[PDB]
Amino acid sequence: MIVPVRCFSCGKVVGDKWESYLNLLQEDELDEGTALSRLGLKRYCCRRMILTHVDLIEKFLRYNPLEKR
């Protein structure tokens, strides 16, 4: 669904780094690895957290029974 709060392995807050990661890939045109480094993710456990995040919430939200069309 959404970006998890804290890394499952150690507990480093990762939830505030999802939108910022996409901005580093789009606007800054950086590679996956360098983008994660600038966010402050050096442990491979914290690295995979954001790198491997799917974000199905954006797919899920497109079904809204409260608004027409």
């Binding site: 809204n64 029974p65 409260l66 608004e67 027409k68």
Partner: protein, 45 residues
């Protein structure tokens, strides 16, 4: 405030007894029961 959401047009329209189970705005036979203001206790675990 009593509520019932239409499944098709998503219009929030509630209807009482001795009334057709259908939305007023459009001819749809399925109605979603809306969530009202009620306390639901939860553990942040």
């Amino acid at each position: 405030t009593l509520k019932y959401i239409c499944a098709e047009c998503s219009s929030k329209l509630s209807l009482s007894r001795t009334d057709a189970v259908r939305c007023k705005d459009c001819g749809h036979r399925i109605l979603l029961k809306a969530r009202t203001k009620r306390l639901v206790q939860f553990e942040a675990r």
